[PDB]
Amino acid sequence: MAVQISKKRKFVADGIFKAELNEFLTRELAEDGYSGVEVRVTPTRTEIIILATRTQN
Amino acid sequence: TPDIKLFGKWSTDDVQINDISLQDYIAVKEKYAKYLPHSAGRYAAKRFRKAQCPIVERLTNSMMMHGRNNGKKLMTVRIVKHAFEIIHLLTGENPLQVLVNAIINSGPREDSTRIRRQAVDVSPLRRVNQAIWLLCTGAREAAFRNIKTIAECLADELINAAKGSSNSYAIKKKDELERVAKSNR
Amino acid sequence: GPLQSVQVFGRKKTATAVAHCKRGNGLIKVNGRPLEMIEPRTLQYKLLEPVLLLGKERFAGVDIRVRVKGGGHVAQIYAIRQSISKALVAYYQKYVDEASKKEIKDILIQYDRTLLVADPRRCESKKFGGPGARARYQKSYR
Amino acid sequence: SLVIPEKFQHILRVLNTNIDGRRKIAFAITAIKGVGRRYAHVVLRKADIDLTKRAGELTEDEVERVITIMQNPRQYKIPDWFLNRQKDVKDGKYSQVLANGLDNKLREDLERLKKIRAHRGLRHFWGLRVRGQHTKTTGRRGRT
Amino acid sequence: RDKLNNLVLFDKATYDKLCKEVPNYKLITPAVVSERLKIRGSLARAALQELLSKGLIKLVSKHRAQVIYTRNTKG
Amino acid sequence: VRRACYGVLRFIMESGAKGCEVVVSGKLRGQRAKSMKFVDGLMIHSGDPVNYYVDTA
Amino acid sequence: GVTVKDVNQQEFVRALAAFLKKSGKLKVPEWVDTVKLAKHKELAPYDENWFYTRAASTARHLYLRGGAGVGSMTKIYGGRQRNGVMPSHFSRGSKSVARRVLQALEGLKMVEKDQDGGRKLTPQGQRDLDRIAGQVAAAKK
Amino acid sequence: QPIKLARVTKVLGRTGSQGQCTQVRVEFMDDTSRSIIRNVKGPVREGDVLTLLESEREARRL
Amino acid sequence: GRVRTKTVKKAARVIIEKYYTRLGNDFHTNKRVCEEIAIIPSKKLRNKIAGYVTHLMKRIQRGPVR
Amino acid sequence: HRIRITLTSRNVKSLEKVCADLIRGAKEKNLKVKGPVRMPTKTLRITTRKTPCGEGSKTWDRFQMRIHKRLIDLHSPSEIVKQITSISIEPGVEVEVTIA
RNA sequence: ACGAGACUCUGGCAUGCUAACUAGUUACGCGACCCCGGUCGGCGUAACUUCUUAGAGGGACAAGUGGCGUUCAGCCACCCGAGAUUGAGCAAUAACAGGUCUGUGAUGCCCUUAGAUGUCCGGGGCUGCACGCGCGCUACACUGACUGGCUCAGCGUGUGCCUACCCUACGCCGGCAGGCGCGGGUAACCCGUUGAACCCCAUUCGUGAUGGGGAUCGGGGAUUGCAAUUAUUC
């Protein structure tokens, strides 16, 4: 890519990506329940799914 | 040839073992004859797997000692090689026959231990291990801070020990054990 | 004509020796240099084991080459020994009878159990809290 | 050859120091201050001499020649960096300071830092370490 | 404690007891002659190459860290 | 803390759990910090099965 | 008739060092009498004719694996830097003394600049390498 | 006191202040009739001949 | 030491009291019958059990077991 | 024409179910396929003290993120590769296609 | 019911299997040298997967035999075999007023909050030395040191979102530390066949605080940075 970082620096930077989700959401979406997410990778489209108990909130 | 095996150039036959008690743990004859005293190993995995290890191998293994020398089996192979080539030019006989008589005339028969120490006999394997011990620690001292090289001091040890001249370190430290054990029993 | 080649291997601590049997005359050399010109010369008769336990006439019609990398000095020496001693026993198993393969195996059995079976000893890993695999750093009271 | 030669010189008298002829030539000269083991092998190279001899067999005439090279290494194209005192503080002469001058140029610069009240020289005046050592745990023989 | 004042270059009394005495020895090594002639080891190495070239002793083991010589043919 | 510890204990039991463990540490009923710990049923501690059989919060 | 890899290496380099004496057009530099071989060395080598020894030792290295540069040459001539009180470390060789060797071997044709970097020996320089190697076997046959 | 050679018939067990000795039952090779107990040092196998500098020193059994 | 624990013994007895007629005498054959009559997660446990089954056979040919 | 694909993942079985999935969609189309070359898997090595302070016996951690990678080479142009790689993929698998 | 075991990784074992122009091997085609034959990390191809890598399964279970034991659990030996105990992570109940509030946007309470215990800058200190203790490194030499020569590795790491800074080949200049130039490497691809020491081979020294030992200290020269004076390292 543009900076073309190695896979070591690519996996762990996207491993830090997961860890910052599972802290950002537990500090906001905790009053409505939170049970982790599942990030899904596609080209030019990155869909994440917030698995939580109270979807109507 | 696959018939006769030489220690490089030293013969392996015609070395009779004088002790019937000690001939069990001296691997030098007709099956344990190797060109070099440097085998791969596989001798410290059973209790008596040390027994069929060749006695010439045990001598080099009993030499790398005191720090710096530990782990250097090549140079003690060269040491014992140079040491052997001295004995045939100093006694005129085969070096192995000297080494056989070196072990036999240095091993303490009795040894005292805590049970007021009861003197008790030794096993022949312990008598071998102490024999290769004493005529190695005596050559390390006679070579230390001395112009006389270790390949020379090793020769002088087992030459004096093979006749029991009561001047070799292995001989003096052996008679003391057999004296103190004779004392308290 | 047809190629009677066998590529027999042999390992040690890390030193791996892959030999290469062939039909022809008898030449025995590793990496381009013969076994009478291999350092350390303190161990020359280890490289001469399968030619003195079997005789120079066994490798008469067989020419062998060995490529070796890795390991250390002594480890390479034992690597070359259980490559060409295993090379002749596998060459004498595919192209001739095993009455001539067992008659060379049993001599290599009774002399040393390393020319045929590798040594499985590998260097033990280091754990924290010490300098080596088993040794620990010095403990200080008071 | 193998025996003692004639007019042997058992001890040499160089820069009012002793040089025993028993020791080899490349290593006997090192008894002089300001010349070590490395600088000895090159003065015996700018002066052609087989350094396998001892310092008590070599002839008297050519040991005078190596003395010329000691206090004057410049004209024998000995390099500038190889010296011990390069770019002198006063007059900037690249020379090799030998024995009596070495312990003369030593107590010439110690007080030069003391007169100017330099922190470097003050430690020499105080008998302490100067190169930035930790004196918490060492220096216990000459420091009572 | 004790100082072994060795000699650096031979004398005509030592050089006399080296050409008729050293080849008489059964074992010849530069360490066994440095202690029966009171000389250094350098003058023990350097004093056996010519006795090798003159053919008064024979070499039996030449090595970097160790060298030993012997008498000539008894016959 | 007692009746709420049960309130989530028996709630997962009907859910279909094999057996669980709730621990509540901290200063309760006074200054010195005790540590209430009410377990039930079947639960393992050691070994590689713990990576997927239990989840900790 | 044989090549160099069937010849003892110890009795080859000084067989080749004297071969770099019977020609005598190597143009040895001026500091050869006063230079230290490496920072891990503390003395100049005893042999006065050392510039002829390593020019031969480098030559057989370019026979075995060519394409070696100066950075490759300061690595083979590396040693254990005994650092006094601190534990020893691997120290590379000197660059200029490694460079003046091959800069002399490109002068009288033995070695040339390899494609994309290196220093491989010339065809006619390989010729005498087999030649001197044969007479070593003649010294032992 | 003439020297005697005596060959093991059975190893009894370990003894000593710290388990450094092996109590070993031995029979004499010069006469298989007479046999005695004798505490030995070092590792002892079965049937290897021992060199007892005295014979009338029987060892006590535990 | 090599002493069989209960979960390799209680699971090897129930095998005999359910499939005595399928297994045989030697280790290797009833090693592969055990993979079929029971679901065992690992392979070490496969050999631990099937080895104990043959040790129990050599106790059955000499009479009953408790 | 000579199109490479570089597979990578942290988990092994998630890749081995989708690496073979390429050929099971490739041999369906009956085109020339190169076998996935198992290149040496790296391992992210991180070691830290267990204790957040400096008290107690010195204990450490051995953290690993061993990372696998496979390479399938094809003999198909840039239009047919968009139908095979687009299907049946796992989240923790990262798929990269090189045109040259 | 837990813990132990089992379990997971790791260590070697499978000329069988899955496949490699980022890995190799053997042939072949020339090329270079030497005497059909030999060497060649010198040069391109069609087969192969032993060597490399890593996938799937396989193999070991006290399975066999000989003694011992209630002849039960099992022990011991031996044959056969790559192993007839590889190493490690994981790790119970209850507790310690063990350590950490200097790991935190974990935090009660108290204190402080404008002349600040906040923040920021400048400079110093964290190294300071009659002395005591702990973990270590080099040593005390000849089984050595020195100088040449020869010859073998495996773990990794490598151009950073902010962040301005990567690992290094080759070619010149320089005694060296280093410098100037142009390249490759986001990596089985370039470093790199990681020419690592020890060791080995051959010189020299010869028992002398010695060429053992390199503390201490003087002079000089380069690199890092805004800055090295209390010596940044070299």
mmCIF file of C-alpha atoms (C1' of nucleotides) in Angstrom, chain C residues 3 7-9 11 14 16 18 20 22 27 29 31-33 39-42 65 67 69-73 76 117-118 120 122 124 127-128 134 137-140 142, chain K residues 11-15 25-27 37-41 50-52 82-83 86-89 133-136 149-154 193-194 196-201:
data_model
loop_
_atom_site.group_PDB
_atom_site.id
_atom_site.type_symbol
_atom_site.label_atom_id
_atom_site.label_comp_id
_atom_site.label_asym_id
_atom_site.label_seq_id
_atom_site.Cartn_x
_atom_site.Cartn_y
_atom_site.Cartn_z
ATOM 1 C CA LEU C 3 21.297 -44.054 -13.443
ATOM 2 C CA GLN C 7 20.289 -39.846 -2.224
ATOM 3 C CA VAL C 8 20.665 -40.904 1.385
ATOM 4 C CA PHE C 9 20.566 -38.381 4.226
ATOM 5 C CA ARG C 11 21.386 -35.791 10.560
ATOM 6 C CA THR C 14 21.632 -29.485 13.324
ATOM 7 C CA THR C 16 22.467 -32.600 7.969
ATOM 8 C CA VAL C 18 22.676 -35.706 2.281
ATOM 9 C CA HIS C 20 24.501 -39.203 -3.228
ATOM 10 C CA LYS C 22 26.006 -43.483 -8.028
ATOM 11 C CA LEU C 27 35.401 -41.607 -5.515
ATOM 12 C CA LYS C 29 34.409 -36.511 -1.570
ATOM 13 C CA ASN C 31 31.676 -30.380 -1.121
ATOM 14 C CA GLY C 32 34.444 -30.965 -3.669
ATOM 15 C CA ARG C 33 37.104 -32.122 -1.235
ATOM 16 C CA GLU C 39 39.242 -30.272 9.055
ATOM 17 C CA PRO C 40 39.533 -30.951 12.001
ATOM 18 C CA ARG C 41 42.242 -33.474 11.202
ATOM 19 C CA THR C 42 42.105 -34.475 14.869
ATOM 20 C CA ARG C 65 29.150 -37.067 -3.109
ATOM 21 C CA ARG C 67 26.504 -31.706 0.285
ATOM 22 C CA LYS C 69 25.233 -27.170 5.440
ATOM 23 C CA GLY C 70 24.416 -26.035 8.954
ATOM 24 C CA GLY C 71 25.417 -27.413 12.313
ATOM 25 C CA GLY C 72 28.915 -27.156 13.740
ATOM 26 C CA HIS C 73 32.346 -28.620 13.109
ATOM 27 C CA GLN C 76 29.248 -32.151 10.558
ATOM 28 C CA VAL C 117 20.374 -44.650 13.679
ATOM 29 C CA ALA C 118 20.552 -40.892 14.158
ATOM 30 C CA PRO C 120 17.826 -37.612 18.625
ATOM 31 C CA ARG C 122 18.543 -31.655 20.485
ATOM 32 C CA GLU C 124 17.197 -28.019 25.319
ATOM 33 C CA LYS C 127 13.788 -20.907 30.599
ATOM 34 C CA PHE C 128 13.706 -17.596 32.431
ATOM 35 C CA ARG C 134 18.620 -26.243 33.921
ATOM 36 C CA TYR C 137 20.950 -17.719 38.852
ATOM 37 C CA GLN C 138 22.546 -17.453 42.275
ATOM 38 C CA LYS C 139 20.152 -17.083 45.199
ATOM 39 C CA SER C 140 21.095 -14.561 47.877
ATOM 40 C CA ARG C 142 20.377 -11.919 54.150
ATOM 41 C "C1'" G K 11 11.744 -32.113 20.605
ATOM 42 C "C1'" G K 12 13.124 -35.820 17.265
ATOM 43 C "C1'" C K 13 9.873 -40.419 13.235
ATOM 44 C "C1'" A K 14 7.484 -41.485 8.556
ATOM 45 C "C1'" U K 15 12.514 -42.071 0.405
ATOM 46 C "C1'" U K 25 17.816 -31.811 -5.788
ATOM 47 C "C1'" U K 26 19.403 -34.535 -9.953
ATOM 48 C "C1'" A K 27 20.123 -34.834 -14.995
ATOM 49 C "C1'" G K 37 37.628 -38.087 -16.358
ATOM 50 C "C1'" G K 38 37.817 -34.117 -12.362
ATOM 51 C "C1'" U K 39 36.288 -29.041 -9.995
ATOM 52 C "C1'" C K 40 32.922 -24.935 -10.520
ATOM 53 C "C1'" G K 41 27.155 -20.719 -4.974
ATOM 54 C "C1'" U K 50 15.666 -37.191 -0.421
ATOM 55 C "C1'" C K 51 17.576 -32.452 1.469
ATOM 56 C "C1'" U K 52 14.014 -26.902 2.607
ATOM 57 C "C1'" A K 82 13.366 -42.701 15.857
ATOM 58 C "C1'" G K 83 12.016 -42.235 20.875
ATOM 59 C "C1'" U K 86 11.721 -34.345 25.950
ATOM 60 C "C1'" G K 87 10.833 -29.658 27.570
ATOM 61 C "C1'" A K 88 7.106 -26.161 28.644
ATOM 62 C "C1'" G K 89 2.439 -23.404 29.283
ATOM 63 C "C1'" C K 133 26.431 -6.097 51.681
ATOM 64 C "C1'" G K 134 24.151 -8.372 47.113
ATOM 65 C "C1'" C K 135 23.793 -9.938 41.434
ATOM 66 C "C1'" G K 136 27.734 -9.971 37.936
ATOM 67 C "C1'" G K 149 46.117 -19.563 8.231
ATOM 68 C "C1'" C K 150 41.901 -22.753 7.751
ATOM 69 C "C1'" U K 151 36.813 -23.823 8.639
ATOM 70 C "C1'" C K 152 31.164 -24.792 10.753
ATOM 71 C "C1'" A K 153 25.692 -22.148 12.987
ATOM 72 C "C1'" G K 154 20.868 -21.508 14.712
ATOM 73 C "C1'" U K 193 24.888 -19.745 1.464
ATOM 74 C "C1'" U K 194 23.736 -14.688 7.971
ATOM 75 C "C1'" A K 196 29.800 -16.043 14.573
ATOM 76 C "C1'" A K 197 33.327 -17.225 17.995
ATOM 77 C "C1'" C K 198 35.382 -21.422 20.684
ATOM 78 C "C1'" C K 199 37.999 -24.990 18.374
ATOM 79 C "C1'" C K 200 41.449 -26.531 14.515
ATOM 80 C "C1'" C K 201 46.560 -25.712 11.667
#
